[PDB]
Paper text:
The activation of the S protein requires the receptor-binding domain (RBD) binding to the peptidase domain (PD) of ACE2 and the cleavage by host proteases into the N-terminal S1 subunit and the C-terminal S2 subunit.
Since PD of ACE2 exists as a monomer, whereas the full-length ACE2 presents as a dimer, a critical question is that how the full-length ACE2 binds to the S protein. We prepared and purified the S–full-length ACE2–B0AT1 ternary complex, which showed comigrating bands in size exclusion chromatography (SEC) analysis. 2D classification exhibited blurred density on the top of each PD of ACE2 dimer, which was attributed to the S protein, suggesting that one ACE2 dimer can be bound by two S proteins simultaneously. After 3D classification and refinement, we obtained two conformations for the S–ACE2–B0AT1 ternary complex with resolutions of 8.3 Å and 4.4 Å, respectively. The right PD of the ACE2 dimer in both conformations is clearly bound by one S protein, whereas the left PD of the ACE2 dimer is bound by a much more blurred S protein and by a much smaller density in conformation 1 and 2, respectively. Furthermore, the structure of the S–ACE2–B0AT1 ternary complex indicates that one ACE2 dimer binds two trimeric S proteins simultaneously. The two PD domains in a dimeric full-length ACE2 cannot bind to the same trimeric S protein because of the steric constriction, unless the RBD undergoes dramatic rotation as suggested by a previous study.
Author numbering:
A (entry chain B): 58 to 737
B (entry chain D): 602 to 737
C (entry chain D): 126 to 193
The structure:
Amino acid sequence: NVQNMNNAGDKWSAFLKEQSTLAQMYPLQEIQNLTVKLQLQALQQNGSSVLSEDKSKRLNTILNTMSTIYSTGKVCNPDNPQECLLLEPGLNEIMANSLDYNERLWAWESWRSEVGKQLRPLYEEYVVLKNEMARANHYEDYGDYWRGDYEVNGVDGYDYSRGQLIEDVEHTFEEIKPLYEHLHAYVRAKLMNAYPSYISPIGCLPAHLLGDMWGRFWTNLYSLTVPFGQKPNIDVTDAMVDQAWDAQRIFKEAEKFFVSVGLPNMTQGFWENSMLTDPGNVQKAVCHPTAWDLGKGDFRILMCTKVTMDDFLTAHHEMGHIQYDMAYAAQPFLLRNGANEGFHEAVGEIMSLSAATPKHLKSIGLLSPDFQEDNETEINFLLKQALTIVGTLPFTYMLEKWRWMVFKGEIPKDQWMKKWWEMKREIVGVVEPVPHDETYCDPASLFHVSNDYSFIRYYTRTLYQFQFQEALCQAAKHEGPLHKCDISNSTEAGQKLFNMLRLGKSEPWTLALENVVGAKNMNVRPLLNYFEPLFTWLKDQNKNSFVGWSTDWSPYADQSIKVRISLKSALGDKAYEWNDNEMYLFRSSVAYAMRQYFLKVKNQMILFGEEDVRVANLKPRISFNFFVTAPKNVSDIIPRTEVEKAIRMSRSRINDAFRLNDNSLEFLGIQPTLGPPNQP
Amino acid sequence: SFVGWSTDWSPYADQSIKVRISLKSALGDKAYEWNDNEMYLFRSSVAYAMRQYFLKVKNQMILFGEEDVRVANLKPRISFNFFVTAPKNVSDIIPRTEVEKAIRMSRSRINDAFRLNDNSLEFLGIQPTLGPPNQP
Amino acid sequence: IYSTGKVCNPDNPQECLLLEPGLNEIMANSLDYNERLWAWESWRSEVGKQLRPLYEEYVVLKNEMARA
Ligand SMILES: *[C@@H]1O[C@H](CO)[C@@H](O[C@@H]2O[C@H](CO)[C@@H](O)[C@H](O)[C@H]2NC(C)=O)[C@H](O)[C@H]1NC(C)=O
Ligand SMILES: *[C@@H]1O[C@H](CO)[C@@H](O[C@@H]2O[C@H](CO)[C@@H](O)[C@H](O)[C@H]2NC(C)=O)[C@H](O)[C@H]1NC(C)=O
Ligand SMILES: *[C@@H]1O[C@H](CO)[C@@H](O[C@@H]2O[C@H](CO)[C@@H](O)[C@H](O)[C@H]2NC(C)=O)[C@H](O)[C@H]1NC(C)=O
Ligand SMILES: *[C@@H]1O[C@H](CO)[C@@H](O[C@@H]2O[C@H](CO)[C@@H](O)[C@H](O)[C@H]2NC(C)=O)[C@H](O)[C@H]1NC(C)=O
Ligand SMILES: *[C@@H]1O[C@H](CO)[C@@H](O[C@@H]2O[C@H](CO)[C@@H](O)[C@H](O)[C@H]2NC(C)=O)[C@H](O)[C@H]1NC(C)=O
Ligand SMILES: *[C@@H]1O[C@H](CO)[C@@H](O[C@@H]2O[C@H](CO)[C@@H](O)[C@H](O)[C@H]2NC(C)=O)[C@H](O)[C@H]1NC(C)=O
Ligand SMILES: *[C@@H]1O[C@H](CO)[C@@H](O)[C@H](O)[C@H]1NC(C)=O
Ligand SMILES: [Zn+2]
């Protein structure tokens, strides 16, 4: 079957480049109808193939090499080199379940460093080749090529520029920063009880204590940050196995939700062709929830559903992709997508929000008609939402802002990892535990960076999701808070939803938003109205706390020693210049001095290397900080009092290696002491 | 043919350089003792000198380490042979003529790290050359 | 350690060869000087180091059992 789909897959791809090279026979500005212009521009798009034919095969070699490094990485446990852990099984489980500080610090660092280095040279060669392909298609860089999805040209008042997306993201983000600061302060106060003597009460959060490998979602911090742990968060999984609900009941109650709002039934080919469970055969078949739109009005759902409220909800999510697909099936073929890249997931998740409410669960038969929702359980529910929704918004905004500045050249390649960690402390409020120089590439250790994907679609989908939900609940005549809303039994709300679903790509997306919301731009005020019961409760829990963070604190910067070097004072017109070969000799001289101290004082032999001296904050005056680490235990920092005694023992030897004289090589905090004079 | 073998030949011992160190001649009653921490500092000073030669002459950046300097035949008089290898290619030995040019470029820096004076740190086969005198 | 040793090819760290399949085939079939020199050294060094401390502790305990 794989050979059955590779030849049938290439007949589709070879056919499309043949019609693409036929499309440049027609000019594009001699067209008047907006629909036939939109189909022509989506087919005329050259994309690749604008490069030289030896540069085009170099780019595909880089994209295949970066993709197989990410999926085949082995991490070695420094106590047993015969057991290598590989990213998805084993390294993702440590970052999501462990409470050991030293084991989370190990998994972060190792993985990072290794994959980092590899993806470095490759990613560097990837930026040059992608900017050449974008400038041959008349964009300024590859970041402007990614923002071409949101572009709208000449439809009388609904236009949108590719540079206008940058201001609308930064204008909407500075209204989330009051809400994110109070969530950052509450999580920091709860993490100090889980990790004492590791977290500052006025500083950033360490990057390896956030719940996963990159801090993208904070959703694994719920067991440490739960407001009222003596109240069970509502879970209807036992009431499903007490009424003998089969595999088919979960979709038939899902189809009754959509026919309740005024949307069509399933297509009745949906029930035979689909595969709602893994089969009765032990059948090798990728088990991953998804919605297929094969064509010719044939819609199938592929998932392996278990009787759980989790897959009761993603059944409502995956059916939402189908009802979006069944609506625009009357457009031409090249306009059968969502209106932008963000609308398709956003319509799927407002079906899941409306089905997870306890108002909907007690009317669908799954909750005791004598159930009492208290105000303590609504805080437990809203905080679990904010760890996934609000916690991912400064991560998404910071990452696309870094990638946009790399493509246009505002960040040169000698400052990639310098500007990356300055933007973590300032925007996200997250500090690294170990300093990282320009041999690492920490963005490329994420999936979407090393596999060539755009990331701004996760920011805009979060904002469209609550704009849709607030506009539908005013049509369904809701009375309470926004997070209690349900659009069942309405017809007027579904008519408000169906007027957008059938457009496809035939209209500009700004014209699609006014059919539901009533505005021409994305707005953050419906997102904040969802979380005002949490924002009121959060401001009362932070009366004795400090809201905000300092970008100066680090988890290593209290065992560091500052070094200051004055070369032109000692030698003057005859002094060498301080390149990074002199930094290599300095790190070997400190590692030599630590070896001599532990042998002659502590009677131990420890093999310190130059890779165990970690240098941060290199300035032009020639100043940096350093701290010393045990040879393969990255979590073991030698204390500052033992490094001062080691440097005092061998200060005369370090001075002679650089021709300095204790006034041109200063260790700040260590002073020369002895020397009584006399002789007469 | 020749029947039998010699126990003196080695496949690396024609790109090796012999080093001789006379500690008690340079300092005398006040000289440190040569443990294996001093051999670690010597292997880092040679790796530093190979880094500076390839950057300023060959315009390349190569990350030589102390594990790329291979020391053999350590004696009590303080003498050994060493040869330099490319950073992870164990089969690539840097030639003897390129290591002599790298040591000549940074001999004054290696001497200062050990307080020796070109008669107490001898690289056998490399000689000091310059120094014309005058002033009147 | 002897039965589960991985050797990494310095041009692709994502492919580790383990003694009986792959490292014994290089030493028995190759005519490349630089590839035989790599397989010898690598394997040697790694397993070498490990078996060192262990083998050192093994001599002391086996001499105690023999002298009793
Ligand atoms: C060009 O634009 C016109 C309107 O601007 C489209 O005309 C409509 O076409 C459909 C079927 O093709 C008719 O049912 C409508 O009644 C037409 N509208 C009007 C106002 O006459 C036309 O379809 C566009 N061209 C293409 C190829 O789609
Ligand atoms: C697709 O690539 C072609 C080049 O192969 C681009 O085209 C040319 O258009 C100019 C006019 O601007 C002509 O003078 C050239 O003759 C065309 N190419 C040649 C030499 O055949 C074209 O602009 C690209 N299309 C897109 C999507 O921008
Ligand atoms: C849930 O509602 C109850 C009922 O109002 C709240 O209890 C009140 O809390 C305030 C502030 O601490 C007190 O001044 C009142 O006297 C309490 N009412 C009673 C009847 O004792 C409770 O604080 C609410 N919980 C949350 C999380 O909002
Ligand atoms: C929302 O829709 C459901 C589904 O039709 C309605 O549920 C019915 O409720 C009545 C009385 O409450 C029962 O006698 C029926 O058996 C229910 N039908 C099903 C299929 O379970 C519900 O009443 C509707 N809500 C409103 C306010 O009309
Ligand atoms: C690496 O160093 C850390 C200390 O920084 C070690 O953690 C200690 O582990 C022991 C037992 O495992 C505990 O009794 C100590 O309380 C731990 N120290 C701290 C500060 O938490 C860790 O064991 C070291 N790892 C290795 C492999 O030696
Ligand atoms: C390691 O160094 C050796 C040389 O000592 C390299 O072998 C050369 O390989 C090229 C092509 O592979 C041949 O043209 C040369 O004739 C080889 N040299 C010798 C002396 O045989 C080897 O390629 C290097 N390995 C790496 C990974 O760089
Ligand atoms: C959808 O199907 C049900 C039975 O499966 C049927 O009763 C209902 O009328 C259908 N909806 C419409 C709009 O016909
Ligand atoms: Zn989805």
